[PDB]
A paper describes a structure:
The active site of 3CLpro is located in the cleft between the two domains and is characterized by a catalytic Cys-His dyad. The polyproteins are processed by a 3C-like protease [3CLpro or main protease (MPro)] (11 cleavage sites) and a papain-like protease (PLpro) (3 cleavage sites), resulting in 16 mature nonstructural proteins, including an RNA-dependent RNA polymerase (RdRp).
Next, compound 7j was cocrystallized with [name]-[name] or [name]-[name]-2 3CLpro, and the structures were compared to that for [name]-[name] 3CLpro and 7j. In the [name]-[name] 3CLpro-7j complex, the backbone of compound 7j formed direct H-bonds with Cys145, His163, His164, Glu166, and Gln189. The electron density map was consistent with both possible enantiomers at the new stereocenter formed by covalent attachment of the Sγ atom of Cys145 in the cocrystal structure of [name]-[name] 3CLpro with 7j. Compound 7j was cocrystallized with [name]-[name], [name]-[name], and [name]-[name]-2 3CLpro.
Author numbering:
A (entry chain B): 0 to 302
B (entry chain A): 0 to 301
Write the structure that this text describes.
């Protein structure tokens, strides 16, 4: 039992920032940082506006007095409002005393983050997930979950990277960064939008193989190597993402810890793809995991 | 379609209670509730002591001044101490305003809880665990993690059920309730301890198969049915826990949601046990998952 486990970041710093935002009877979640509340702009939609909302026209009919923002049941009065891409920015009359040190970041495909799933401004649960190559997430969300956020924590600083907006017909999820710019080609309206065909996150498969070596499972290592270009051409024929120069460097620490060169681990993965596992397991499993990152492996080696 | 994830409870209410406890050069985590700090008693051991500790002897050799308790950058003054089973209770001269409504619960095998893994008094990660039938937990704990706690939240009440103490040679973990009594046959000493042979938590496998159907993965359903007794015969043959009628009752709501009678899901599981998965996956897993309770599935899927 290796102890390598998917973990969420402790959510308390984000819990202290969750509020509910209501227009009429539509309620979703918002993020309260200093004296601003961020939330998805479709809170202003009625059922008849959802199919193809004219958000600019809808917001013309709205005043500060139209928005009910609550921390629990305590109202926070709105003193200003504007739209920023697919988000509303609501200025409120109170600076959140629980505001952590924070940044807004744009996540890249293959990277992971924690999601604090919230309903009516009340946190329900926290889980880890990855941004897929096709710019969706395999989340877990019910009605009322919009405005739940995704985040990473680095020491004392919360990096917010995702705000939740919609579900796609295949049951995966789409959303924006905290500037309101969607990840992927998606738009916030009540229409069926197909995601592109997904691929396997090669960087994380390689991390998982390094994790298996660290734990003493090494049957899949070989005495051969590959060039990066040759590997990437084979990868794409197996619907694996190509490796980038950044990916190779991210794997530096695991390569150094194990003494297995990145391109030698790529050669091992190429052999697994072409030959299959033919029965065997890796870290107790028959299929290769692709949502456990190099950062996760390294972090969980020692205390 | 909701999707389906291993989901922990939000950890904020517990994070506000974590402190660091040091005695000599041993440091671990404590739980600060009102004016009491709870922590594993082996904080009082040196390296040598841990091989065969006489804890009553070791503790009478300490005073209040022997314990350094720190809440971030602030030392808390220890003004009394006592031992209850394998925990220490340190009385401090400050009350924690962040104390949630709470209770102490001893959980039963099959039940799940969230773990807030902490190092040097600082929260690092949160994940979901089940109490195994053999009274271990398959955790992720490194040096410095002792005193990390497991918990559930109902309404606004935190039910603490686990405090972490040790790792076994197999890599699984053992600890206590918040009364200091170990789950299982384990003892807090630096020796290699084996657990009893584990079994699979049938009620949870069934709840997870229902979660799979709710999310549209239903290849394992079939036309067969079974009685409860004939299911339990096969279950026990395969080292699965028997199902009681009270357990069938618990699955009622998931049954009504999917329209799949509990005993029909049992017949599906019986076939999975006898035939294997034939290389197929359920909710992306190549094995039958038994660390989701019915409540965990309902929480997420309704
Ligand atoms: C917290 O103090 C610490 C947590 C463990 C360290 C590694 N993973 C853990 O979960 N607990 C311990 O170090 C205990 C202290 C004893 C006095 C109870 N000891 C422990 O976990 O030792 C694990 C060893 C035991 C011998 C072995 F061969 F089985 C290898 C594992
Ligand atoms: C906001 O809470 C909500 C979250 C979704 C509800 C169920 N799961 C979710 O993730 N968001 C929405 O309901 C959006 C609102 C738009 C105006 C942005 N709509 C949405 O997600 O539609 C989902 C449907 C639409 C396409 C489909 F018909 F193919 C099936 C999914």
């Amino acid at each position: 039992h290796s102890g390598f486990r998917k973990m969420a970041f402790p959510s308390g710093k984000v819990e202290g920032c969750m509020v509910q935002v209501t227009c009429g009877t539509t309620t979703l979640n918002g993020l309260w940082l200093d004296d601003t509340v961020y939330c998805p702009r479709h809170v202003i939609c009625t059922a008849e506006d959802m199919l193809n909302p004219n958000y600019e026209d809808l917001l013309i009919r709205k005043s500060n007095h139209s928005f009910l923002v609550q921390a629990g049941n305590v109202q926070l009065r709105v003193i200003g409002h504007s739209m920023q891409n697919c988000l509303l920015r609501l200025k409120v009359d109170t600076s959140n005393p629980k505001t952590p040190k924070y940044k807004f970041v744009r996540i890249q495909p293959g990277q992971t983050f924690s999601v604090l799933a919230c309903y009516n401004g009340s946190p329900s649960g926290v889980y880890q997930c990855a941004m897929r190559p096709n710019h969706t997430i395999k989340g877990s969300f019910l009605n009322g979950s919009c405005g739940s956020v995704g985040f990473n924590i680095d020491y004392d600083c919360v990096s917010f990277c995702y705000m939740h907006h919609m579900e796609l017909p295949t049951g995966v999820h789409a959303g924006t960064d905290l500037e309101g710019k969607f990840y992927g080609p998606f738009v916030d309206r009540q229409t069926a939008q197909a995601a592109g065909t997904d691929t396997t996150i090669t960087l994380n498969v390689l991390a998982w193989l390094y994790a298996a070596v660290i734990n003493g499972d090494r049957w899949f290592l070989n005495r051969f190597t590959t060039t990066l270009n040759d590997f990437n051409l084979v990868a794409m024929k197996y619907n694996y993402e190509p490796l980038t120069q950044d990916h190779v460097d991210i794997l530096g620490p695991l390569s150094a810890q194990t003494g297995i060169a990145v391109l030698d681990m790529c050669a091992a993965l190429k052999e697994l793809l072409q030959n299959g596992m033919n029965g065997r397991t890796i870290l107790g499993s028959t299929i290769l995991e692709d949502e456990f990152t190099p950062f996760d492996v390294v972090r969980q080696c020692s205390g």
